[PDB]
Scaffold this active site. Structure first.
Site, short mmCIF file in Angstrom:
data_model
loop_
_atom_site.label_atom_id
_atom_site.label_comp_id
_atom_site.label_asym_id
_atom_site.label_seq_id
_atom_site.Cartn_x
_atom_site.Cartn_y
_atom_site.Cartn_z
N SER A 145 0.87 -1.19 0.00
CA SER A 145 0.00 0.00 0.00
C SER A 145 0.90 1.23 0.00
CB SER A 145 -1.00 -0.10 1.15
OG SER A 145 -2.00 0.90 1.01
N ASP A 253 -8.33 -2.65 -6.26
CA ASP A 253 -7.81 -2.42 -4.92
C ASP A 253 -8.81 -1.62 -4.09
OD1 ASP A 253 -5.02 -2.59 -3.32
OD2 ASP A 253 -6.13 -0.77 -2.80
N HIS A 298 -7.40 -5.73 -0.40
CA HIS A 298 -6.35 -4.76 -0.08
C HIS A 298 -5.11 -5.48 0.41
CE1 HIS A 298 -4.62 -1.12 2.17
NE2 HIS A 298 -4.54 -0.87 0.88
C1 LIG Z 1 -4.53 4.60 -0.16
C2 LIG Z 1 -3.56 5.41 -0.97
N1 LIG Z 1 -3.95 6.18 -2.02
C3 LIG Z 1 -2.86 6.78 -2.60
C4 LIG Z 1 -3.00 7.63 -3.81
F1 LIG Z 1 -3.61 8.77 -3.54
F2 LIG Z 1 -1.81 7.92 -4.34
F3 LIG Z 1 -3.69 7.04 -4.74
C5 LIG Z 1 -1.75 6.41 -1.93
C6 LIG Z 1 -2.15 5.54 -0.89
C7 LIG Z 1 -1.10 4.96 -0.05
O1 LIG Z 1 -1.42 4.71 1.19
O2 LIG Z 1 0.01 4.76 -0.52
#
Ligand SMILES: Cc1[nH]c(C(F)(F)F)cc1C(=O)O
Ligand SMILES: *[C@@H]1O[C@H](CO)[C@@H](O)[C@H](O)[C@H]1NC(C)=O
Length: 353
Positions: A145, A253, A298
């Site tokens: 993530s 995801d 996830h």
């Molecule tokens: C949940 C999430 N969304 C993003 C984004 F905005 F880049 F898509 C990064 C993350 C992360 O925790 O790395």
């Protein structure tokens, strides 16, 4: 079990200024080193970092970290749970900088919080050199993530760090799990106030400013001043990377759907979801080492049952072993590009439940 080591350089800090650190389990019979970057979203202004400090404190501070941690999934030393790298040296780097592992700014009279994720990685790698990393043959920087995006932001800097330090023979490689995001339009147009509902593009732009976030050099040179947020998106930063990177990404995801404001599915949502899977598949076409099953889920690689999912009959542990073999063209029976083609969550029957 993996044993905590707080960084000997205490000026490399979590958000609240407590020492950052790492959990280590040595495997002296091995020249392979797995450094795993934890995930956990981010915060991009004083207000939402204050709220995260109040009820997600472990992601901002080492003060309450336990002395040991059990290695699971790819961090397991048991062959049954980890057929890939069970014998490797295992390092778990807790995420306590809330900056997607990009920051390089210290806490000061003017900054309420420190955002040092990129300096954390660098300093961990430094202190590990004296604990056996100097003899390593492969250093796999892995992450899930936000840690998966951290891999993409940091793998080449680690390569370059070890080169300039005089360790040319350590092969630095990347394994980005669930960190391959699309800066697409949301299903519904919520306004960026908090961190989950906020659209990815505006999230990262504000964050970089607040963290003093840094991105890979060649990607930076493409997008130029002000547009560095672009390099937080795998399909834009990946082509500029020099280190080998294996990409693991659910086509659907849950974190992607969250930032897209997706939660009896009518035509509009069905089309949006199918378009999302096709776009993600499109961005992976030219990623030769990838594992992207058609599942709504996830993260994956440190879950105990990460061995269960398959694409085209091949498990992720097998695919990662084929990738190792490919870096000693295509290997017989040892495929490395595994991207589902079916268009809906769980059309792959091995998706987790
Ligand atoms: C949940 C999430 N969304 C993003 C984004 F905005 F880049 F898509 C990064 C993350 C992360 O925790 O790395
Ligand atoms: C300790 O970390 C600080 C902050 O990044 C850095 O300026 C300094 O060079 C580090 N100390 C050593 C001995 O590398």
């Amino acid at each position: 079990d993996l044993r905590l080591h707080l960084l000997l350089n205490t000026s490399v800090t979590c958000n609240d200024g407590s020492p950052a650190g790492y959990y280590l389990k040595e495997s002296r019979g091995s020249r392979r080193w797995l450094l795993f970057l934890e995930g956990g979203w981010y915060c991009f202004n004083r207000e939402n970092c204050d709220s995260r400090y109040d009820t997600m404190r472990r992601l901002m501070s080492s003060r309450d970290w336990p002395r040991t941690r059990t290695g699971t999934g790819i961090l397991s030393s048991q062959p049954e749970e980890n057929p890939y790298w069970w014998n490797a040296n295992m390092v778990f780097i807790p995420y306590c900088s809330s900056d997607v592992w990009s920051g390089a700014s210290s806490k000061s009279e003017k900054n309420e919080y420190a955002f040092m994720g990129a300096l954390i990685i660098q300093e961990v790698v430094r202190e590990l050199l004296g604990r056996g990393l100097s003899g390593a043959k492969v250093l796999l920087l892995a992450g899930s993530s936000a840690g998966g995006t951290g891999v993409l932001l940091n793998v080449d800097r680690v390569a370059e760090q070890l080169e300039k330090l005089g360790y040319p023979a350590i092969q630095v490689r990347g394994l980005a799990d669930s960190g391959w995001f699309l800066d697409n339009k949301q299903y519904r147009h919520t306004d960026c106030v908090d961190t989950i509902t906020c659209a990815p593009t505006e999230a990262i732009r504000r964050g970089i400013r607040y963290w003093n976030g840094v991105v890979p050099e060649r990607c930076r040179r493409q997008f130029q001043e002000g547009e560095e947020w672009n390099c937080f998106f795998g399909y834009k930063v990946y082509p500029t990377l020099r280190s080998p990177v294996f990409v693991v990404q659910w086509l659907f995801d849950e974190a992607q759907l969250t930032v897209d404001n997706v939660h009896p599915v009518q035509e509009g949502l069905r089309l949006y979801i199918q378009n999302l899977g096709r776009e993600l598949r499109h961005t992976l076409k030219d990623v030769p080492a990838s594992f992207a099953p058609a599942c709504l889920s996830h993260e994956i690689i440190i879950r105990s049952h990460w061995t269960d999912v398959q694409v085209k009959g091949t498990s992720l542990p097998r695919a990662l072993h084929c990738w190792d073999r490919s870096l000693h063209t295509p290997l017989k029976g040892c495929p490395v590009h595994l991207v589902d083609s079916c268009p809906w969550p769980h059309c792959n029957p091995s998706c987790p439940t």
